[PDB]
Model the fold of this input.
Amino acid sequence: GSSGSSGETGGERQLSPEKSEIWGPGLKADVVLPARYFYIQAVDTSGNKFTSSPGEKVFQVKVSAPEEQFTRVGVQVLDRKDGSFIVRYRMYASYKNLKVEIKFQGQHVAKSPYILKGSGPSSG
Done:
């Protein structure tokens, strides 16, 4: 069997990933013990907040450690607010350093990946 789909649109602002800002308790020094979750705000080319509902599956998140490999991370994106989203993930293995990667249709949203290693001060 086989089928197809369709959908037209236009006029709306120009959703821009680069602009979109990614903030949360994840990109911090003292993160949560178990798992953390950050928010993803959709911004246009004019640096304006979409504060709207784009769709169900529009933004994705990748989780993988530079030292440890073969990490089956099942991240799920759910629309909590009428503009922002929540990113949750589960892991049953040692977590020393992870790499956050956010992309949109082949376009990086934030300054990813994100390398977070070394308790604050290191050089010293």
Summary: The chain has one domain: 13-119. Strands lie at 15-16, 43-44, 60-64, 76-78, 86-88, 99-103, 114-115. The first strand starts at residue 15 and ends at 16.
